[PDB]
Design a protein around this motif. Structure first.
Motif, PDB file in Angstrom:
ATOM      1  N   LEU A   1      -1.456   8.395  10.908  1.00  0.00           N
ATOM      2  CA  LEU A   1      -0.991   7.933  12.213  1.00  0.00           C
ATOM      3  C   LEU A   1      -0.248   9.175  12.968  1.00  0.00           C
ATOM      4  O   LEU A   1      -0.110   9.118  14.037  1.00  0.00           O
ATOM      5  CB  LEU A   1       0.001   6.686  12.158  1.00  0.00           C
ATOM      6  N   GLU A   2       0.121  10.075  12.448  1.00  0.00           N
ATOM      7  CA  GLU A   2       0.840  11.132  12.939  1.00  0.00           C
ATOM      8  C   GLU A   2      -0.158  12.052  13.628  1.00  0.00           C
ATOM      9  O   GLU A   2       0.061  12.887  14.364  1.00  0.00           O
ATOM     10  CB  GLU A   2       1.522  12.016  11.735  1.00  0.00           C
TER      11      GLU A   2
ATOM     12  N   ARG B   1      -0.515  -3.568   4.500  1.00  0.00           N
ATOM     13  CA  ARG B   1       0.412  -2.649   4.756  1.00  0.00           C
ATOM     14  C   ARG B   1       1.715  -3.025   3.813  1.00  0.00           C
ATOM     15  O   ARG B   1       2.380  -2.308   3.185  1.00  0.00           O
ATOM     16  CB  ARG B   1       0.888  -2.295   6.097  1.00  0.00           C
TER      17      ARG B   1
ATOM     18  N   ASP C   1       0.179   1.477   3.037  1.00  0.00           N
ATOM     19  CA  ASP C   1       1.208   1.739   4.015  1.00  0.00           C
ATOM     20  C   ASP C   1       1.377   3.345   4.084  1.00  0.00           C
ATOM     21  O   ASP C   1       1.372   3.699   5.188  1.00  0.00           O
ATOM     22  CB  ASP C   1       2.392   1.005   3.851  1.00  0.00           C
TER      23      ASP C   1
ATOM     24  N   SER D   1       0.515   5.623   7.320  1.00  0.00           N
ATOM     25  CA  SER D   1       1.758   6.088   7.836  1.00  0.00           C
ATOM     26  C   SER D   1       1.562   7.947   8.108  1.00  0.00           C
ATOM     27  O   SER D   1       1.645   8.332   9.087  1.00  0.00           O
ATOM     28  CB  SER D   1       2.949   6.265   6.944  1.00  0.00           C
ATOM     29  N   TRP D   2       0.753   8.276   6.951  1.00  0.00           N
ATOM     30  CA  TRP D   2       0.291   9.693   6.997  1.00  0.00           C
ATOM     31  C   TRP D   2      -0.615   9.994   8.171  1.00  0.00           C
ATOM     32  O   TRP D   2      -0.545  11.024   9.218  1.00  0.00           O
ATOM     33  CB  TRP D   2      -0.191  10.170   5.601  1.00  0.00           C
TER      34      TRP D   2
END
Ligand SMILES: Nc1ncnc2c1ncn2[C@@H]1O[C@H](COP(=O)(O)OP(=O)(O)O)[C@@H](O)[C@H]1O
Ligand SMILES: Nc1nc(=O)[nH]cc1C#CCNS(=O)(=O)C1CCCC1
Length: 283
Positions: free
Chosen positions: A230-231, A216, A223, A227-228
């Motif tokens: 993980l939402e 990451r 990353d 990050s996208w």
């Protein structure tokens, strides 16, 4: 006659780095599960002793291709023990769906599928142990695919204890960057001191991947994809990357997230498989 053979992807559902051997490789604790998704390898026997991969893999030279290397290695091992019917050869084609590089193990799966298929087609009679031993010379990922079962892996990845993790649905994403495996494993800051723990402990602990923090940090594309995702769902690097996956309980939810995903996630959805599609085909 042509035969067709699955070559499935794998995920590392967790990955802990426990140390490093003198020859450079890392000792780890990892949990391999297949995906019911991957390449398809078609084989037509030859009777002139030749081995021909008819469909190139992008960026890979014929004699460097793990498909050809596996086939030649089985032919040499079988011929040296008298197990190769005279004239044994093959034409091999692949419909390649798995990225070249990425942590899904496509090249290792290709090698394993070829070893298993040609051992059957040429009637070499090699045992599972023998094929896995030859497979390990082509890559530490190859034995799990040869043996065909989800497994807790120790050592460098060849010490395989079959386990049956839950067969979740996964959105597998491929960030737009190629990460050579040696970069991660050469990074000074890679954990190589994660305590070696029992499978019960690792199954109750949250799953993580010790390579993720470095992937990451060093690759903004990874990353961004992580990050996208993980939402929406628990999401992690597989292998040393670049591929990332998100875990879902249902096919419906995974596909709804994929429908929403920007094209730069380069995603697909697949179910986990504790029995390799290769070995389900072999029945
Ligand atoms: N049939 C193949 N498919 C994919 N990669 C191959 C194959 N034969 C050789 N390779 C080589 O292996 C690398 C990718 O291996 P792969 O198992 O796809 O890696 P990863 O585990 O990162 O997905 C590339 O550098 C490529 O040169
Ligand atoms: N043990 C190793 N040490 C190295 O230095 N290189 C490669 C190794 C291997 C392996 C078994 N495959 S694996 O999927 O479990 C592994 C590869 C990507 C991340 C986890």
């Amino acid at each position: 006659m042509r035969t067709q053979w699955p070559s499935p992807a794998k995920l590392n559902l967790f990955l802990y780095i426990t140390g490093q051997r003198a020859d450079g490789y890392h000792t780890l604790q990892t949990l391999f599960q297949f995906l019911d998704y991957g390449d398809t390898i078609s084989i037509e026997l030859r009777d002139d002793g030749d081995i021909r991969l008819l469909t190139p893999v992008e960026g890979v030279e014929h004699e460097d291709n793990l498909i050809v290397r596996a086939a030649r290695l089985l032919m040499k091992t079988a011929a040296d023990s008298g197990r190769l019917p005279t004239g044994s050869g093959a034409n091999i084609s692949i419909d390649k769906r798995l990225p070249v590089g990425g942590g899904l193990g496509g090249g290792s799966s290709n090698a394993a599928t070829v070893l298993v298929a040609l051992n059957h087609l040429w009637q070499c009679g090699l045992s599972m142990d023998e094929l896995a031993e030859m497979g390990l010379t082509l890559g530490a990922d190859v034995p799990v695919f040869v043996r065909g079962h989800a497994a807790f892996a120790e050592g460098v990845g060849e010490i395989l204890t079959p386990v049956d993790p839950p067969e979740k649905w996964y959105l597998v994403a491929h960030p737009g960057v190629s990460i050579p495996t040696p970069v991660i494993f050469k990074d000074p800051e890679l954990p190589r001191n994660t305590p070696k723990r029992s499978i019960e402990t690792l199954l109750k602990c949250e799953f993580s991947n010790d390579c993720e923090v470095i992937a990451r940090k060093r690759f903004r594309e990874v990353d961004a994809v992580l990050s996208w995702l993980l939402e929406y769902a628990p999401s992690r690097l597989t292998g040393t990357g670049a591929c990332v996956f998100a875990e879902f309980d249902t096919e419906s939810e995974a596909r709804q997230v994929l429908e929403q995903a920007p094209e730069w996630l380069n995603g697909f959805v697949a179910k986990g498989v504790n029995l390799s599609p290769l070995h389900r085909a072999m029945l």
